[PDB]
Amino acid sequence: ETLRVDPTNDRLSALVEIYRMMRPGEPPTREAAESLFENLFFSEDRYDLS
């Protein structure tokens, strides 16, 4: 049911929608979406469980 509510279809559209829910109302770019989603959870700088 979750995948039936999804409008997205590939990696790029998902990264665009996540970049759009983070910072509202601005043009996304594939480099900016990759950089944001790698700096949310997957970087030693901005994310750190102890």
Partner: protein, 98 residues
Amino acid sequence: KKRWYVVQAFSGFEGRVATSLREHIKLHNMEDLFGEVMVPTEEKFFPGYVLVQMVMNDASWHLVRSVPRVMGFIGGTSDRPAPISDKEVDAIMNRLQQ
């Protein structure tokens, strides 16, 4: 053809914003996508706005907003921000010349 745009900075750090903007241009070497950077001055209007000769790609837009101490462009919308005008650029250059 490169048209003009208005950038808002933290008012007071404007010369440092202009220098950092020129340096980010010569770092990310989009040299064919930037013409000048104006901060006009009388013996200082405009109080906190930086004029940029530019073109509009989303890469150059992210470049100017990734320059530090820059809030954003000032236009009708944030998708396609707004250039100003022909005669308005000519009058600003007129009073800068005068």
